[PDB]
Amino acid sequence: GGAAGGKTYLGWWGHLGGPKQKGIITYSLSPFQQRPMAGFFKTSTQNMFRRVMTEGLYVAIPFGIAYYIYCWGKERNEFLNSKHGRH
Amino acid sequence: PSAEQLSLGAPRGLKPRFVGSEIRARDDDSPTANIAIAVEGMSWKHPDYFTALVMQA
């Protein structure tokens, strides 16, 4: 094959092009030994509460302002083309 | 002689539970890579001892 390909930043398994690692022990269990639906509700509720309390206003402010100007624009546009608006 | 007069090689305690898992002690400076894979085997008194030895052979 060969063909002398170019330069990338991914590689493949075995040589992923990353810095050399040392002294990183990792443990994991088997899917048949662990239990799904264990601590899901508690952790999910805590994460959702933290995310709502943390991000929050970032979304709350622009959407609220946009909705307010939407309502005001609809009301004013309906008023102006009515009888009393044109006068 | 011991107070608990038992036989030779008899089990003493709870039977351990085989728990499938994995351990990865990465080290990028080692030229080689040693891997060991095992399943649950047979005890000394199991009636399927020599069969396991035959399969190993």
Swiss-Prot record, chain A:
PANTHER family: CYTOCHROME B-C1 COMPLEX SUBUNIT 8 (PTHR12119:SF2), UBIQUINOL-CYTOCHROME C REDUCTASE COMPLEX UBIQUINONE-BINDING PROTEIN QP-C (PTHR12119)
GO-annotated biological processes: mitochondrial electron transport, ubiquinol to cytochrome c
Organism (species): Schizosaccharomyces pombe (strain 972 / ATCC 24843) (Fission yeast)
One GO term describing the cellular component: respiratory chain complex III
One protein family per Pfam: UcrQ
Name of the protein: Cytochrome b-c1 complex subunit 8
Disulfide topology: none
Membrane topology (UniProt): Single-pass membrane protein
UniProtKB keywords: Electron transport, Membrane, Mitochondrion, Mitochondrion inner membrane, Respiratory chain, Transmembrane, Transmembrane helix, Transport
Segments on the Mitochondrial intermembrane face: 81-87
Similarity field: Belongs to the UQCRQ/QCR8 family.
The protein's role, per its UniProt record: Component of the ubiquinol-cytochrome c oxidoreductase, a multisubunit transmembrane complex that is part of the mitochondrial electron transport chain which drives oxidative phosphorylation.
Curated annotation (Swiss-Prot), chain B:
Annotated compartments: Mitochondrion matrix
Origin: domain of life: Eukaryota
Signal peptide: none
Quaternary structure, from the entry: Heterodimer of mas2 (alpha) and qcr1 (beta) subunits, forming the mitochondrial processing protease (MPP) in which mas2 is involved in substrate recognition and binding and qcr1 is the catalytic subunit.
Family designation: Belongs to the peptidase M16 family.
Functional note: Catalytic subunit of the essential mitochondrial processing protease (MPP), which cleaves the mitochondrial sequence off newly imported precursors proteins. Preferentially, cleaves after an arginine at position P2.
Protein's UniProt name: Probable mitochondrial-processing peptidase subunit beta
Lineage: Eukaryota, Fungi, Dikarya, Ascomycota, Taphrinomycotina
Encoding gene per record: qcr1
Span within the parent record: 230 to 286 of 457
